[PDB]
Amino acid sequence: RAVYLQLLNRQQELNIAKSSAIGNVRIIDNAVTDPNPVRPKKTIIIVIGVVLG
């Protein structure tokens, strides 16, 4: 009956670890959008146009 209580304790420890389960993923920074557009880059476009002309 001692092994019965030992298995009960191990099962409870597994219940705790399964319920908590801190995964390998901790979202440090949730997604945010930069208000300045990345394309098109107006200045380089105008410079390229002038140089090409």
């Binding site: 705790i16 319920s19 908590s20 801190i22």
Partner: protein, 36 residues
């Protein structure tokens, strides 16, 4: 700028003191929530 950098350092240090005490924190909270 001195105050800002001091605040940054204090926040980092306090977070790491807290981050060190983290895995057990969630385990203990669930244990508190699981006591019959």
């Amino acid at each position: 700028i001195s105050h800002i950098l001091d605040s940054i350092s204090q926040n980092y240090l306090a977070q790491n003191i807290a981050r060190q005490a983290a895995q057990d924190a969630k385990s203990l909270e669930f244990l508190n929530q699981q006591l019959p």
